[PDB]
Enzyme design. Structure first.
Site, PDB file in Angstrom:
ATOM      1  N   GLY A 201     -11.944  -2.637   4.983  1.00  0.00           N
ATOM      2  CA  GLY A 201     -11.767  -2.840   6.400  1.00  0.00           C
ATOM      3  C   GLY A 201     -10.964  -1.708   7.030  1.00  0.00           C
ATOM      4  N   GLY A 209     -14.973   8.404  12.414  1.00  0.00           N
ATOM      5  CA  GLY A 209     -14.502   9.227  11.303  1.00  0.00           C
ATOM      6  C   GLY A 209     -15.028   8.765   9.944  1.00  0.00           C
ATOM      7  N   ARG A 216     -12.068   8.743   2.798  1.00  0.00           N
ATOM      8  CA  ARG A 216     -11.352   9.923   2.345  1.00  0.00           C
ATOM      9  C   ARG A 216     -10.008   9.510   1.757  1.00  0.00           C
ATOM     10  NH1 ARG A 216     -11.357  11.045   7.946  1.00  0.00           N
ATOM     11  NH2 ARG A 216     -12.330   9.010   7.635  1.00  0.00           N
ATOM     12  N   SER A 242      -9.625  -7.330   2.971  1.00  0.00           N
ATOM     13  CA  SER A 242     -10.116  -6.159   3.685  1.00  0.00           C
ATOM     14  C   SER A 242     -10.159  -6.394   5.183  1.00  0.00           C
ATOM     15  CB  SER A 242     -11.469  -5.764   3.177  1.00  0.00           C
ATOM     16  OG  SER A 242     -11.331  -5.069   1.959  1.00  0.00           O
ATOM     17  N   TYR A 245      -7.324  -5.667   7.375  1.00  0.00           N
ATOM     18  CA  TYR A 245      -7.121  -4.268   7.715  1.00  0.00           C
ATOM     19  C   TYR A 245      -7.947  -3.826   8.927  1.00  0.00           C
ATOM     20  CZ  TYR A 245      -4.163  -3.587   3.637  1.00  0.00           C
ATOM     21  OH  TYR A 245      -3.185  -3.716   2.690  1.00  0.00           O
ATOM     22  N   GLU A 330      -7.014  -5.573  -6.055  1.00  0.00           N
ATOM     23  CA  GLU A 330      -7.250  -4.362  -5.307  1.00  0.00           C
ATOM     24  C   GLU A 330      -7.861  -3.371  -6.275  1.00  0.00           C
ATOM     25  OE1 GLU A 330      -3.606  -2.415  -3.561  1.00  0.00           O
ATOM     26  OE2 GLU A 330      -3.561  -4.509  -2.887  1.00  0.00           O
TER      27      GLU A 330
HETATM   28  C1  LIG Z   1       0.744   1.157   3.474  1.00  0.00           C
HETATM   29  N1  LIG Z   1       0.565   2.574   2.958  1.00  0.00           N
HETATM   30  C2  LIG Z   1      -0.736   3.244   3.277  1.00  0.00           C
HETATM   31  C3  LIG Z   1      -1.815   2.311   2.856  1.00  0.00           C
HETATM   32  C4  LIG Z   1      -2.446   1.548   3.859  1.00  0.00           C
HETATM   33  C5  LIG Z   1      -3.441   0.653   3.524  1.00  0.00           C
HETATM   34  C6  LIG Z   1      -3.808   0.437   2.194  1.00  0.00           C
HETATM   35  C7  LIG Z   1      -4.867  -0.498   1.840  1.00  0.00           C
HETATM   36  N2  LIG Z   1      -4.807  -1.252   0.647  1.00  0.00           N
HETATM   37  C8  LIG Z   1      -5.948  -2.003   0.553  1.00  0.00           C
HETATM   38  C9  LIG Z   1      -6.305  -2.911  -0.469  1.00  0.00           C
HETATM   39  C10 LIG Z   1      -7.539  -3.503  -0.296  1.00  0.00           C
HETATM   40  F1  LIG Z   1      -7.970  -4.368  -1.237  1.00  0.00           F
HETATM   41  C11 LIG Z   1      -8.412  -3.258   0.742  1.00  0.00           C
HETATM   42  C12 LIG Z   1      -8.084  -2.307   1.778  1.00  0.00           C
HETATM   43  C13 LIG Z   1      -6.800  -1.671   1.677  1.00  0.00           C
HETATM   44  C14 LIG Z   1      -6.096  -0.739   2.478  1.00  0.00           C
HETATM   45  C15 LIG Z   1      -6.599  -0.090   3.742  1.00  0.00           C
HETATM   46  C16 LIG Z   1      -8.101   0.141   3.617  1.00  0.00           C
HETATM   47  N3  LIG Z   1      -8.954  -1.076   3.726  1.00  0.00           N
HETATM   48  C17 LIG Z   1      -9.026  -2.147   2.852  1.00  0.00           C
HETATM   49  O1  LIG Z   1      -9.880  -3.027   3.040  1.00  0.00           O
HETATM   50  C18 LIG Z   1      -3.218   1.256   1.194  1.00  0.00           C
HETATM   51  C19 LIG Z   1      -2.205   2.152   1.517  1.00  0.00           C
END
Ligand SMILES: CNCc1ccc(-c2[nH]c3cc(F)cc4c3c2CCNC4=O)cc1
Length: 353
Positions: A201, A209, A216, A242, A245, A330
């Site tokens: 998400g 982007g 990326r 997800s 997010y 994750e």
């Molecule tokens: C908080 N520091 C930067 C950061 C921001 C977001 C994420 C993150 N962790 C996830 C675990 C997951 F299972 C799914 C997602 C994410 C994210 C952001 C990307 N989208 C996801 O669905 C990882 C690192």
């Protein structure tokens, strides 16, 4: 003018993701001062300078410095990346958590710089502007029928893997698109085992982007402690992990959620956060943060060569004895060639109260 040759559903998606006025509003919500630093003047150099200042903040945090040195590091960040805190003195970024929470702002700015470059693209009266934006994505988006098998299986995945603790909302699938990003098939690690269709998400501002550049990895300049499992691309097997997010709201309750084939290969399984997870792989292909609850083998189906971990989820027996346990898995890969984007879901968030 010239008429759009696009399917109306794609027209609607383009309008949604290329709306710059929505991008300004969202950045305003994240406290970015679009009056001091207008989004149309964002540069890559400004954003990288941002990350560099966050690295200096990380330096202070690691040293236990909460005084002038951190005050000046934050001042530098806030000068390069202007914030609006009202009549408050700008708050210091004092802890790894606060720092980690700021990365998302720089990531959105990166994707907005991309989006604005694309929408401002020279343009020829020959094609409708929606069609021109679509072409400039270099990403095919094919709408699927609500009666299709795809739509039924994805709808089932979306619903059956909505996690019990993400109880603040339900989701309705409004539309579904098959995605084919130029170059992704050719790069994809088809050789790797454990190919799964997993969720990702993102905020509405990010999709030009994402669709034009792919998912990326964080840049070299970013502070490593900002990423729980390092500088990779993160995915869930639970839809709502997800979808959280997307940062949908009661007023903006339409989001986009991506499914991607992820070539996990052999997972390095971890219970706890380790921003340096990537150096732990030693031949393995991906990191798996272990959750207490996950889909089980029993209910899986395959789509175009990938495992779809349909729910219901059940208890995994996982419990960290020495600290915090993730509620849900994750997955993190550290090369974009382990990702092929496949479906873009347009999701309505049905909030409570
Ligand atoms: C908080 N520091 C930067 C950061 C921001 C977001 C994420 C993150 N962790 C996830 C675990 C997951 F299972 C799914 C997602 C994410 C994210 C952001 C990307 N989208 C996801 O669905 C990882 C690192």
């Amino acid at each position: 003018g010239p008429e759009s040759q696009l399917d109306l559903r794609v027209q609607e998606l383009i309008k949604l993701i290329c709306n710059v006025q929505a991008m300004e509003e969202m950045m305003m919500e994240m406290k970015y001062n679009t009056k001091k630093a207008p989004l149309g003047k964002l540069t890559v150099a400004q954003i990288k300078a941002g990350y560099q200042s966050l690295k200096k903040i990380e330096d202070c945090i690691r040293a236990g410095q909460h005084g002038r040195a951190l005050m000046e590091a934050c001042n530098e960040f806030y000068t390069r990346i202007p914030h609006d805190f009202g009549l408050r003195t700008p708050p210091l970024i004092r802890t790894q958590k606060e720092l980690s929470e700021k990365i998302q702002l720089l990531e959105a700015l990166g994707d907005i710089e991309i989006a604005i470059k694309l929408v401002k693209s020279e343009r020829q009266g020959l094609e409708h502007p929606l069609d021109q934006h679509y072409r400039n994505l270099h990403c095919a988006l094919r709408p699927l029928d609500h009666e299709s098998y795809e739509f039924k299986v994805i709808s089932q995945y979306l619903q059956s893997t909505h996690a019990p603790t993400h109880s603040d909302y339900t989701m309705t699938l409004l539309d579904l698109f098959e995605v084919e990003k130029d170059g992704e098939k050719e790069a994809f690690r088809e050789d790797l085992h454990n190919r799964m269709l997993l969720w990702h998400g993102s905020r509405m501002s990010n999709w030009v982007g994402i669709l034009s550049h792919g998912l990326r990895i964080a840049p070299p300049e970013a502070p490593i402690t900002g990423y729980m499992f390092g500088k990779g691309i993160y995915f869930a097997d639970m839809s709502s992990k997800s979808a959280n997010y997307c940062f949908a709201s009661r007023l903006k309750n339409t989001g986009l959620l991506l499914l991607s084939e992820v070539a996990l290969g052999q997972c390095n399984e971890l219970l706890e956060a380790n921003p340096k997870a990537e150096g732990l792989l030693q031949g393995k292909h991906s990191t798996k943060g272990l959750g207490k609850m996950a889909p089980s083998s029993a209910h899986f189906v395959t789509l175009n060569g990938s495992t779809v971990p349909l729910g219901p989820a059940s208890d995994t027996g996982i419990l960290n004895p020495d600290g915090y346990t993730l509620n849900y898995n994750e997955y993190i890969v550290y090369n974009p060639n382990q990702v092929r984007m496949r479906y873009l879901l347009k999701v309505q968030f049905n909030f409570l109260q």
